[PDB]
Amino acid sequence: TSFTRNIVGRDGLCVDVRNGYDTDGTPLQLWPCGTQRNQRWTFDSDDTIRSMGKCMTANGLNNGSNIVIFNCSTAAENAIKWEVPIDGSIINPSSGLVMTAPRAASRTILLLEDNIYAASQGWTVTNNVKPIVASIVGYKEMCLQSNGENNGVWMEDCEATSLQQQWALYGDRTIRVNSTRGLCVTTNGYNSKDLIIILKCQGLPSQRWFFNSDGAIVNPKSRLVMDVRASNVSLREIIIFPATGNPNQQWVTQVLP
């Protein structure tokens, strides 16, 4: 069984076989999303990921290796098999390494690296290649709000016209300021009680998030979750904290018109 999708990652750019060339060994790169065949990836039961009839292929199996296009039958079986874990990683199970966009720019070549749960290692397999713009509603049915670069995020009464309450949910599993998409919801550290702020997107593990099945927003590296500090909205502090199941750790996205 198979299905075809784009693969969206860092900065909303897509996995692209350079200029539609399919010569074995051509590096895969980031490029703005489109519908051309060199961004259309077919996922099959054999765990291959194919474009133009050739495979997404690990050029070697150690950290820092290139990912390239390659003839499926002549490439090593270990090099051409991939899985897609629920948290947005794309993993080569033979090596345990994960697909990585080591820099943000278009034309960045993609690498296989040790998983560090970086935003540079988050991907979304989808035909919708535009970020989803949403409100993020939490404790006391208030809305998460941005308050400028380098400042804390916090909760306020929802307002449909408030630009500061609008979030672009990018394919790399980042949560961006919708009006200023170079800025990311960022934990200022990986320890319990570290503050959530807005910082320039830099592909960091502190900028990667996962909306889990329990209503939590999880930072995969820390394992900790977004938390309205001390269940007190007047503190105007959102932190990471261990998952407790409490209402101050529950969030829902609401798509905006």
Ligand X SMILES: *[C@@H]1O[C@H](CO)[C@@H](O[C@@H]2O[C@H](CO)[C@@H](O[C@@H]3O[C@H](CO[C@H]4O[C@H](CO)[C@@H](O)[C@H](O)[C@@H]4O)[C@@H](O)[C@H](O[C@H]4O[C@H](CO)[C@@H](O)[C@H](O)[C@@H]4O)[C@@H]3O[C@@H]3OC[C@@H](O)[C@H](O)[C@H]3O)[C@H](O)[C@H]2NC(C)=O)[C@H](O[C@@H]2O[C@@H](C)[C@@H](O)[C@@H](O)[C@@H]2O)[C@H]1NC(C)=O
Ligand Y SMILES: *[C@@H]1O[C@H](CO)[C@@H](O[C@@H]2O[C@H](CO)[C@@H](O)[C@H](O)[C@H]2NC(C)=O)[C@H](O)[C@H]1NC(C)=O
Ligand Z SMILES: *[C@@H]1O[C@H](CO)[C@@H](O)[C@H](O[C@@H]2O[C@@H](C)[C@@H](O)[C@@H](O)[C@@H]2O)[C@H]1NC(C)=O
Ligand U SMILES: *[C@@H]1O[C@H](CO)[C@@H](O[C@@H]2O[C@H](CO)[C@@H](O)[C@H](O)[C@H]2NC(C)=O)[C@H](O[C@@H]2O[C@@H](C)[C@@H](O)[C@@H](O)[C@@H]2O)[C@H]1NC(C)=O
Residues in touch with ligand Z (CB under 6 A): 53-54, 71, 73-74
**Residue sitting closest to ligand Z (CB):** 71
Give which of ligand U, ligand Y, ligand Z, none residue 40 binds (C-beta under 5 to 8 Å, depending on kind): none
Q: Per rule CB under 6 A, is residue 102 in the interface with ligand X? A: yes
d(CA 193, CA 181): 26
Name which of 212, 223, 216 is nearest 190 in CA terms. Answer: 223
In angstroms, what is the minimal distance from the CB of 52 to ligand Z?
Answer: 8
Q: Segment contacting ligand X (CB under 6 A): 5-13, 111-119, 186-194, 224-232?
A: 111-119
Determine which residue in the list 106, 150, 191, 232 makes contact with ligand U, applying CB under 6 A. 232
Q: Which does 232 bind (CB under 5 to 8 A by kind): ligand Z, ligand X, ligand U, none?
A: ligand U
Nearer to ligand U, 142 or 235 (CB): 235
Residue 256 partner contact from ligand U, ligand Y, ligand Z, none using kind-dependent CB cut-offs of 5 to 8 Å: ligand Y
- Shortest Å, Cβ 190 to ligand X: 16
Q: Is 20 in the site for ligand X (CB under 6 A)?
A: no
Q: How far is the CB of 238 from ligand U (least distance, A)?
A: 13
CB atoms inside a 10 Å sphere around CB 131: 20
Which 56-75 residues touch ligand X, going by CB under 6 A?
A: 63-64
| Binding of residue 27 to ligand X (CB under 6 A) | no
Query: What, of ligand U, ligand X, ligand Z, none, does residue 246 touch, CB below 5 to 8 Å by kind?
Result: none
- What is the contact surface with ligand X in residues (CB under 6 A)? 63-64, 102, 111, 113-114
